[PDB]
Design an enzyme around this catalytic site. Structure first.
Site, PDB file in Angstrom:
ATOM      1  N   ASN A 167      33.414 -12.387  76.656  1.00 31.23           N
ATOM      2  CA  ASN A 167      34.754 -12.166  76.998  1.00 31.23           C
ATOM      3  C   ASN A 167      35.728 -13.401  76.850  1.00 31.23           C
ATOM      4  OD1 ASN A 167      34.760  -9.252  77.371  1.00 31.23           O
ATOM      5  ND2 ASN A 167      34.455  -9.090  79.394  1.00 31.23           N
ATOM      6  N   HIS A 185      35.655  -0.968  75.518  1.00 28.41           N
ATOM      7  CA  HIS A 185      35.975  -1.924  74.548  1.00 28.41           C
ATOM      8  C   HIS A 185      36.069  -0.989  73.340  1.00 28.41           C
ATOM      9  CE1 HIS A 185      35.078  -5.989  76.255  1.00 28.41           C
ATOM     10  NE2 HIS A 185      34.453  -5.133  77.165  1.00 28.41           N
TER      11      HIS A 185
HETATM   12  C1  HEM Z   1      30.317 -10.678  82.037  1.00 30.10           C
HETATM   13  C2  HEM Z   1      30.589  -9.091  81.985  1.00 30.10           C
HETATM   14  C3  HEM Z   1      30.557  -8.413  80.685  1.00 30.10           C
HETATM   15  C4  HEM Z   1      31.038  -8.636  79.482  1.00 30.10           C
HETATM   16  C5  HEM Z   1      31.596 -10.139  79.098  1.00 30.10           C
HETATM   17  C6  HEM Z   1      30.912  -7.512  78.795  1.00 30.10           C
HETATM   18  C7  HEM Z   1      31.504  -7.403  77.319  1.00 30.10           C
HETATM   19  C8  HEM Z   1      31.556  -6.529  76.617  1.00 30.10           C
HETATM   20  C9  HEM Z   1      31.853  -6.266  75.231  1.00 30.10           C
HETATM   21  C10 HEM Z   1      32.322  -7.470  74.571  1.00 30.10           C
HETATM   22  C11 HEM Z   1      31.618  -5.011  74.702  1.00 30.10           C
HETATM   23  C12 HEM Z   1      31.736  -4.690  73.595  1.00 30.10           C
HETATM   24  C13 HEM Z   1      30.943  -5.228  72.303  1.00 30.10           C
HETATM   25  C14 HEM Z   1      31.475  -4.533  71.085  1.00 30.10           C
HETATM   26  O1  HEM Z   1      32.164  -5.387  70.584  1.00 30.10           O
HETATM   27  O2  HEM Z   1      30.926  -3.879  70.791  1.00 30.10           O
HETATM   28  C15 HEM Z   1      30.987  -4.311  75.779  1.00 30.10           C
HETATM   29  C16 HEM Z   1      30.652  -3.117  75.830  1.00 30.10           C
HETATM   30  C17 HEM Z   1      29.917  -2.474  77.102  1.00 30.10           C
HETATM   31  N1  HEM Z   1      29.790  -2.968  78.106  1.00 30.10           N
HETATM   32 FE1  HEM Z   1      30.234  -4.722  78.858  1.00 30.10          FE
HETATM   33  N2  HEM Z   1      30.535  -6.364  79.150  1.00 30.10           N
HETATM   34  C18 HEM Z   1      30.084  -7.043  80.642  1.00 30.10           C
HETATM   35  C19 HEM Z   1      29.820  -6.204  81.621  1.00 30.10           C
HETATM   36  C20 HEM Z   1      29.248  -4.986  81.643  1.00 30.10           C
HETATM   37  C21 HEM Z   1      28.580  -4.304  82.719  1.00 30.10           C
HETATM   38  C22 HEM Z   1      28.352  -5.034  83.939  1.00 30.10           C
HETATM   39  C23 HEM Z   1      28.086  -3.115  82.086  1.00 30.10           C
HETATM   40  C24 HEM Z   1      27.426  -2.188  82.847  1.00 30.10           C
HETATM   41  C25 HEM Z   1      26.202  -2.445  83.615  1.00 30.10           C
HETATM   42  C26 HEM Z   1      28.735  -3.030  80.711  1.00 30.10           C
HETATM   43  C27 HEM Z   1      28.437  -2.027  79.922  1.00 30.10           C
HETATM   44  C28 HEM Z   1      28.954  -1.973  78.453  1.00 30.10           C
HETATM   45  C29 HEM Z   1      28.727  -0.781  77.825  1.00 30.10           C
HETATM   46  C30 HEM Z   1      27.914   0.451  78.182  1.00 30.10           C
HETATM   47  C31 HEM Z   1      29.417  -1.048  76.900  1.00 30.10           C
HETATM   48  C32 HEM Z   1      29.696  -0.277  75.620  1.00 30.10           C
HETATM   49  C33 HEM Z   1      28.599  -0.980  74.607  1.00 30.10           C
HETATM   50  C34 HEM Z   1      28.324  -0.058  73.184  1.00 30.10           C
HETATM   51  O3  HEM Z   1      28.642   1.145  73.246  1.00 30.10           O
HETATM   52  O4  HEM Z   1      28.025  -0.709  72.293  1.00 30.10           O
HETATM   53  N3  HEM Z   1      29.304  -4.259  80.540  1.00 30.10           N
HETATM   54  N4  HEM Z   1      30.921  -5.105  77.148  1.00 30.10           N
END
Ligand code: HEM
Ligand code: HEM
Ligand code: HEM
EC number: 1.11.1.6
Lengths: 679, 681, 249, 83, 83
Positions: free
Chosen positions: C119, C46
């Site tokens: 999402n 993202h």
């Molecule tokens: C329903 C499943 C998921 C949704 C809805 C989701 C949604 C998101 C969203 C919307 C962001 C960006 C947030 C922002 O605008 O700063 C994000 C970042 C991220 N997500 Fe997911 N995610 C999901 C699953 C996962 C999973 C399963 C992992 C790993 C176990 C993961 C790891 C991350 C990481 C590492 C980032 C970067 C966040 C940051 O640098 O602050 N996500 N995710």
């Protein structure tokens, strides 16, 4: 050779011209200037590339155990233990596994004294052919706290005050003693830290403990509870606080040099790897929970079984690249070993992996030569700060048709993969509480104290008396004495005297007279010497040097390194009188015809500080070290008031002094030279 | 004959035929989390999950502060002879001497994920892995830079890059801030004219000319120096797109140049560049009507002919983009014995900047220990410790002077140990000041020399770019300020832009007006020396046996060196791309196969397989973008549906003999400028 | 300078008129050091996105269903900040690329920061978090050449979907209008996971978070979306910015 | 001394730390950087500029009580690596 | 958990709940995206998985790819619609 894998990354600069980090021969001794007496130019790439490296040389020290030292070694298995564990480094006869051990203190920072009073670290890396296996232990079988969540609280309390950062490498302050009086779980490790275990003679004269209870899984899945132990072949030996304080100032690298010297001299240190086997069903059968890190298992209920031997034969080539950069983790587990539901162990697995990112500034810390395994790494991990490798595999995801299924999944049945114990179950409500079986904090501290010699027990009380006298808060002192009274009324009344407070109320709830083996330091005799540090106080005038050299030759014959002390560096002089001190040696011997320098005009020399030779002798005796005098040297002992024959003190001819001083070292420290209460 | 990546072998990791392991060894199963029961919570004691996710969570490093978007390739540099008479350099020290290289091409304002075909200055940075240290020529595709003092670099970048409030726009200079800077800093006007031309939107990294920009010095063994200008002349020839094409390509394929290079190396047709130089005497530094320490001015070929020194060819693609392309850290301060700096205020500040930035991008000082950065010369210095120290140093006496280390590592200079030395003749004279030379004051003559040296149609593309870009400025005063500056270069240029903006441009200023012309600045004048690696799109159909006739055209074309892609409704026997996947931006030549006219008219155009009127659009786009268009036999009806003459310049109609040889001719021309409207009609 | 004191940062300190720059020019170094170290790593996923500040108002006292503070009162105003984004795309990637869109919302409650990191699609590709690197590595650009940017139209991505059948639902959603929406404002948001809503007493209820757009769901067509990625890569970023400035929040 | 801070503080905003911050006030076009503690109000973070009305303005010896090098200071002689 | 084993019912519920032209857009995205796969076996593997959701969806995508693999698997086939 254990260091063989490091030979490919080893750089020689001999017979070579100075180059920049990006190649090309240079001259890094003069700055580029605008004229003769002009300003330095920005276009001097040589200066900048040299200074940029220097400006960024330092990495953060470890959050705990910042002060320490390591050595490379070879672990040999005594036999095929496939019946008890599926581990690879153990399931074969005479199997040689490369090792690396880093011993350390706790509260002390990077530059802190080796001889400070603290819990000592004993971290061991097993470079198995089935991955890196770490037993991140301590020289004390018990830890202060029961839940890993309380670790910041314990460390913040023992470490220097946040306002002024006083004191360094010490627990003699309000904050540390408030925590012990407020968290009674901390009382067992305190008693161990207040004993000889807190101020040991060397890293080689230390016993190591894995602390936690672990599991040993067989190929089939059958588990057995286990307790890791490192028994020193050199034997347990400890200093006295009065000696320890002077040594912290005279030589802050005492233990660091002790290890370095041993390996270089050929006398490499050894440790036997012992275990305590316990049935899964007998986890609460021994009067305490085996998931408790504040309690240890006595040898009487479970005998130690030796599995092999670890010897440290190689010193590092670069302290930074090897010792400073090594990143241990108790989570570095292999097939055959498994964790227990020990709340302290559980939280450690997270903490150690996390911290690595601060210390190393990225995730590829395992790619560093000292950290990398011998087994081989094939995973889907890619990118990250300072990627050292170039992955041939472009299909870096799983499952996949494109990569024909490689790297493949391995588990219990296939590819010798790691697996959790099948019997392991989760039962009950999810909660933020601790088991009622963890509620006993006073029985185990008394078992240790009751298992020490009369003079040793004094040392415990003489450490508490010292440390508590530093507490400025009157209520903290009372709170400490209230907690100490719950362990033993004798311990509490003896400490109370030094503090000026009177609070004796016997609480017979956790009082007992039970004794356990293998907890005492001085009780057993020293096996080999091999220790050693013998100081010979001689003089440059009267032909004493020639007589001192003869004593030096005969004493070293039994595998020693004797240092001859005189006014200046003559033919057979290794150390001068201004450079030498009693803390540096274990045995102090005055050579025949050594003046007149102890109390006469010879004591006033511009070469050494006023009354130095006399001080070395005075210090030795008061610290319980075996003292000796050859022939005429009897007047040296008389100048302070030391009788001819008592304890370690032996006089006579040359050979008459050698035999007896060697027997003194077997005892190491003469406990009869220390005042016990009630006299 | 040899692999240019031979040194990176030591670090390659094959995982074929191996079980999954942790970073610390030991076989594992990384597909299921450890849970407390069947439908239970995940346990902290799951080391497998944590070690896998920790690595992933820490995958990204910061992108380059500038030139973030780009792609590289490994190569081999061969010297044409022994240049010891002109330079003490080792890589130029012998005939047919093979020196390993690595080139990274890029944009400037664009971020890591930005489009390759955006209107920017392009980067062209070469690493020479000399047997005497790493030598970098960190250059651009334009011989002139925007600013004269390196201290102004943050100002220029902050202005061209996205607005700080909303971060709009990405990889573009069409905004108030960028155009305020150009109108306020008149030094920026030369590079602007270059960026507004074909140099701003090139066809590929291979069809680019590279320039070292600064003036440098070439020191001989004896100490005698000569002023020098680095040039990279493409053996493929200069080729550029049109803005209208470039905009559609940024969306259709943002990895256009990235793929172009990758494909060339894999297909065997490796790109080449000749290394040319402009030699100038120290005493003739201000003799050419401008200061040679000025990065806003270039030296015309008429005053100093180019002299070829050798040839650089890129024969190997990287194995891991991150470890190689992303992690490469170039520095113009990566200098060797034989080369030296000049008192160019832009160059001076660059030497500091490039070394500094690496600490952010790499988070430590051992970035030079990384396989892609490490020299082949060998490293012997008293540098110790530092984040991620990869080496175990054997010398325990890490200082100089020293008795203990026997004097090793030893000092090397001009006379001893073939060490680096500054030019002996170089002197410092005068007051220490924060000013710029009066010789740097001319900012309008050189922009006009470039413009006067372009073809009439090329000149319109410059005009139109400015018309496009300036129309985005919301501030009325900024637009006037821009037109005032443009009027100082040429009154014709200013009046033509003024029309599009709605505001008139007073008043002719004949101070820097001239009709002088210079050679080798035009992209569209000279024809391509080769037609290989040029993409041609064959619009065919699954019905009427057109596929069979299209395959025959594809065969004869592929044997010439060209890369042919057959477009149809679905992926049949000889179909590579479908009609929904294909676009005119992807190709240089658009040819309609016999019997494909059926998908232009009637129901044939209304298919659920592709969007409404797609085949027609590919043909329409290709003609309006000046690409040579062709039709075989009956396919003449396809051109007729939009209004295209079969006997027009660039348009080919006839048989499968006439089209095949007729199209490949039009590719040499690349872009037919006659289809573009010029002002004055 | 960053350490105070009035300066002139437009000319470098030189040794003479046409001389070399001096190391003693602290002004140049302190200005360029800041610039050289301006960039931080982009989000692992993202990376491309945009945000806006807002105000959350409660329709009533939901103490019966949850002990939350931002909900247990009538007309309670809680400050918010939402960051909408794509997935596979890097920092400079096109707003109109075909991907799952992000909908991260911060509730600045008087009882702590509460995040609903969702999402625009109610379902995720994988069932176990351990498989997240596998999914991301597969959908993101190829590791050898780093092609393609902000797209799932490649061998690796389609091998994963065919090998991990769990990924098939989110694929159908990504392949629909949900994959190429008109704007961040014309998007529905979903918390995806099932959560629990605990009352003061301890009684729990399973819950699914939903964000229903008052503007209504609107999506582009792929043929339009491809041209827009090139003509204006900040399409959604500007769409939001313009709405707030124009008054129509 | 300026260089080393990047290692010790892991970024360029070390001057924003309470102990380092001046009392004089900070007005420059420095933006972004690890751990940016401030929200800058001027969107035209460059010089020269029409849009920012010329702010932050350049200060020297004669204008805005700015820093200046000693006027008498001169450079004379050959550029060398000697003492 | 075994309760996580169903991966084809829910995709069909969504598809069955879209308008005729919308459903086309879904298939016109898959046709576009899959036409980029260079591996012949990956395309077949995709169509095998798509056939498990809906035989109509699978046959329509198959046409664009040039491959013919229609074998109706009525295990997770249903006509249920959600709002
Ligand atoms: C329903 C499943 C998921 C949704 C809805 C989701 C949604 C998101 C969203 C919307 C962001 C960006 C947030 C922002 O605008 O700063 C994000 C970042 C991220 N997500 Fe997911 N995610 C999901 C699953 C996962 C999973 C399963 C992992 C790993 C176990 C993961 C790891 C991350 C990481 C590492 C980032 C970067 C966040 C940051 O640098 O602050 N996500 N995710
Ligand atoms: C039985 C209890 C414990 C023992 C025996 C123990 C022992 C050690 C030792 C010996 C080291 C230094 C290893 C080396 O030489 O590099 C160490 C480091 C450390 N320990 Fe502990 N520890 C214990 C409990 C804890 C707990 C409970 C935590 C937090 C949950 C913790 C966190 C750390 C951290 C963060 C470091 C620094 C490690 C590094 O930078 O590599 N330890 N511990
Ligand atoms: C003639 C003028 C210039 C040219 C030709 C030039 C060219 C380039 C190129 C081609 C790159 C990217 C290299 C790569 O592919 O990795 C680059 C990066 C960069 N340039 Fe420039 N540059 C110029 C002036 C400047 C100036 C004046 C500064 C500041 C004083 C500067 C600072 C940088 C920095 C900090 C980077 C990022 C480098 C990295 O992260 O490795 N450049 N420049």
């Amino acid at each position: 050779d254990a260091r063989q894998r490091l030979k490919e990354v080893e750089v020689d600069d001999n017979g070579q011209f100075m180059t920049t980090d990006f190649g090309g021969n240079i001259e890094e001794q003069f700055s580029l200037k605008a004229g003769g007496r002009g300003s330095t130019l920005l276009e001097d790439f040589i200066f900048r590339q040299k200074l940029q490296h220097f400006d960024h040389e330092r990495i953060p020290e470890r959050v705990v155990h910042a002060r320490g030292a390591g050595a490379h070694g070879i672990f040999t298995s005594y036999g095929d233990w496939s019946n008890i564990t599926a581990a690879s480094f153990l399931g074969a006869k005479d199997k040689q596994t490369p090792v690396f051990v880093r011993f350390s203190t706790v509260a002390g920072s990077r530059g802190s004294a080796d001889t400070a009073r603290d819990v000592h670290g004993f971290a061991t890396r097993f470079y198995t052919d089935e991955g890196n296996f770490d037993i991140v232990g301590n020289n004390i079988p018990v830890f202060f706290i029961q839940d890993a969540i309380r670790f910041p609280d314990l460390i913040h309390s023992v470490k220097p005050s946040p306002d002024n950062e006083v004191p360094q490498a010490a627990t003699a302050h309000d904050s540390a003693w408030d925590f012990f009086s407020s968290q009674p779980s901390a009382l067992h490790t305190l008693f161990w830290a207040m004993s000889g275990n807190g101020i040991p003679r060397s890293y080689r004269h230390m016993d190591g403990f894995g602390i936690h209870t672990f599991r040993l899984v067989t190929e089939d899945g059958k588990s057995k509870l286990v307790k890791w132990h490192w028994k020193t072949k050199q034997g347990k030996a400890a200093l006295v606080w009065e000696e320890a304080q002077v040594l912290a100032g005279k030589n802050a690298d005492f233990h660091r040099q002790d290890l370095w010297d041993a390996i270089e001299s050929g006398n490499a240190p050894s440790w036997e790897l012992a275990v305590q086997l316990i049935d899964e069903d007998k986890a609460q059968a021994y009067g305490f929970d085996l998931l408790d890190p504040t309690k240890f298992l006595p040898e009487e209920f479970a005998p130690l079984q030796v599995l092999g031997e670890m010897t440290l034969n190689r010193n590092p080539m670069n302290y930074f690249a090897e010792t400073e950069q090594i990143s241990f983790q108790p989570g570095h587990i292999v097939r055959g070993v498994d964790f227990t539901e020990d709340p302290l162990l559980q939280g450690r697995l997270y903490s150690y992996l996390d911290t690595q990112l601060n210390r190393h500034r990225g995730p590829n810390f395992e790619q560093l030569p000292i950290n990398r395994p011998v087994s081989g790494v094939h995973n889907n991990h890619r990118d990250g700060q300072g990627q050292a490798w170039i992955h041939k595999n472009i299909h870096h995801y799983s499952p996949s048709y494109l990569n024909k299924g490689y790297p493949a999944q391995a588990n219990q049945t296939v590819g010798r993969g790691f697996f959790t114990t099948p019997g392991r179950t989760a039962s009950g409500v999810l909660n933020r509480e601790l088991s009622a079986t963890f509620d006993d904090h006073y029985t185990q501290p008394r078992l240790f104290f009751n298992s020490l010699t009369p003079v040793e027990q004094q040392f415990v009380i003489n450490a508490i008396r010292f440390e508590a006298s530093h507490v400025t808060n009157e209520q903290v002192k009372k709170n400490v004495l209230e907690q100490l009274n719950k362990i033993s009324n004798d311990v509490a009344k003896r400490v109370a005297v030094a503090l000026g407070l009177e609070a004796p109320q016997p609480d017979p709830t956790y009082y007992h007279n039970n004794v356990t083996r293998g907890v005492s330091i001085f009780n057993e005799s020293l096996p080999t010497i091999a220790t050693l540090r013998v100081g010979v106080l001689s003089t440059t005038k009267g032909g004493s040097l020639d007589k001192a050299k003869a004593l030096k030759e005969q004493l070293e014959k039994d595998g020693l390194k004797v240092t001859v002390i005189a006014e200046y560096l003559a033919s057979g002089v290794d150390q001068t009188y201004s450079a030498a001190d009693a803390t540096a040696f274990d045995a102090v011997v005055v050579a025949e015809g050594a003046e007149r320098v102890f109390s006469g005009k010879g004591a006033m020399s511009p070469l050494f500080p006023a009354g130095r030779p006399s001080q070395i002798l005075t210090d030795g005796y008061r610290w319980g070290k075996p003292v000796a005098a050859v022939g005429s040297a009897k007047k040296a002992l008389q100048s302070i008031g030391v009788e001819e024959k008592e304890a370690g003190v032996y006089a006579g001819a040359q050979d008459e002094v050698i035999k007896g001083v060697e027997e003194g070292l077997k005892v190491f420290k003469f406990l009869e030279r220390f005042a016990v209460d009630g006299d």
